Amino acid sequence: TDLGLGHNGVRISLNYFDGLPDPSLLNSLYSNELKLIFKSLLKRDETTKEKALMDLSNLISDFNQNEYFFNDIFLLCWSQIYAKLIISDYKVIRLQSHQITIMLVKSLRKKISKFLKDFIPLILLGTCELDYSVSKPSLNELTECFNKDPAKINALWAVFQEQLLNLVKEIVVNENEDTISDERYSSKEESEFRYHRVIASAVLLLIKLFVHNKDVSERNSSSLKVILSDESIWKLLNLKNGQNTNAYETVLRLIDVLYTRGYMPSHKNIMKLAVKKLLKSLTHITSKNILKVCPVLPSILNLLATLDDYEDGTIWSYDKSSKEKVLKFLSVSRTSPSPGFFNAVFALYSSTKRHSFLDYYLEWLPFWQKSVQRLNEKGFSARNSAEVLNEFWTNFLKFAEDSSEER
Ligand SMILES: [K+]
Numbered sequence: 001t002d003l004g005l006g007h008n009g010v011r012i013s014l015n016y017f018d019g020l021p022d023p024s025l026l027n028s029l030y031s032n033e034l035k036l037i038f039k040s041l042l043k044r045d046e047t048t049k050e051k052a053l054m055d056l057s058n059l060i061s062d063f064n065q066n067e068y069f070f071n072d073i074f075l076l077c078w079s080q081i082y083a084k085l086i087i088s089d090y091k092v093i094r095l096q097s098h099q100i101t102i103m104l105v106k107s108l109r110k111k112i113s114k115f116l117k118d119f120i121p122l123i124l125l126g127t128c129e130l131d132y133s134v135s136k137p138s139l140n141e142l143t144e145c146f147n148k149d150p151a152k153i154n155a156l157w158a159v160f161q162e163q164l165l166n167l168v169k170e171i172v173v174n175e176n177e178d179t180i181s182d183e184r185y186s187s188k189e190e191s192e193f194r195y196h197r198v199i200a201s202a203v204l205l206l207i208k209l210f211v212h213n214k215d216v217s218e219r220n221s222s223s224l225k226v227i228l229s230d231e232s233i234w235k236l237l238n239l240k241n242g243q244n245t246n247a248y249e250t251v252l253r254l255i256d257v258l259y260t261r262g263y264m265p266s267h268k269n270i271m272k273l274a275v276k277k278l279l280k281s282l283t284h285i286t287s288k289n290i291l292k293v294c295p296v297l298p299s300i301l302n303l304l305a306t307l308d309d310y311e312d313g314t315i316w317s318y319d320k321s322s323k324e325k326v327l328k329f330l331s332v333s334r335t336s337p338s339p340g341f342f343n344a345v346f347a348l349y350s351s352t353k354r355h356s357f358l359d360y361y362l363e364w365l366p367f368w369q370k371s372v373q374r375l376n377e378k379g380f381s382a383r384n385s386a387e388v389l390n391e392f393w394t395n396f397l398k399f400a401e402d403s404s405e406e407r
Helices: 023-027 032-041 046-061 072-085 091-107 113-127 132-145 150-159 161-174 188-212 221-229 246-260 268-284 290-307 314-318 322-333 341-355 360-378 385-400
Strands: none
Touching (some): 023 032, 023 072, 032 046, 032 072, 046 091, 091 113, 091 132, 113 132, 113 150, 113 161, 113 188, 150 161, 150 188, 161 188, 161 221, 188 246, 221 268, 246 268, 268 322, 290 322, 290 341, 314 322, 322 360, 341 385, 360 385
């Protein structure tokens, strides 16, 4: 049987309809107080959950009196609902749930070693939550749980890399908008936003896994292929609305790491999947939303310059109208340039000229011309006027020195 995130006989999942504590297992709990606490956590009413978690948290803080209660039956049950609690919209529920688990690890050391495979990956997922109101306190209490040693934390990323990837796979491949949220009690927007948060956390977790493990690609090739071949991660490459750009930038970073490590060159199918979605997202940038998106444009351009190095600009062939997309993307983005922008544009020019992607005089030159025109009319009133203006001229002069052979 597929136990999902579970490694001790019971199924642990993030969805709402399975991986639930068996009614018999619950009745076998030590104290009648626990039975009610758990029955309270299996409901939907989130008000009574905050108290139930508070009560449970109190029983664990007073570990002296209460200890025989926190046995294997408790850990099996808790490990199942813990997974479902950390996807709640109420950040208090997610935070308290993490603290409880962290407290259990810190208190039942050795006695809980068997369950660490189930708890650590979810704790770390909490530290990867883009909301710092949850990810910072979680990481703090976690770091404190291990003698305040950040090296002991970095070890966790290596020890549990298999279970960490399995968690990613569960979020990305197996669950979706309609399994993380019950359509009967949740609107479409609610479901989307909820799933977005969870998968966004998974992408960051996935990135941290490459940071801490130099051989992750080779040691987990089959697991990574399943994760990255799915469409779900790459669907995050969306700048339309309503989400901010945090998740978007995180995927950019993932693509970069994957390319740098030489993973994507090894998996053309996955690279085609990511790039197609990346190129399509360029069309999401308009005058309507340029002011919300402009701080991530240097990242886009730099990534495209990097990818252009693959097989002499082969990535551009993944989209029949990639040239047109880039042109329209450049014309929009020059209206609201930010620091690093012109450095990135030149990076793209310097790389793509090797196969004459865009015309020097009919396409590149007017871009630079209209750019300085924009900078002169508005600035230098705006902030970072001097920095950006100087950045433009430094890069244009380098661009202009190629006008030699292009004549
Ligand atoms: K999915």
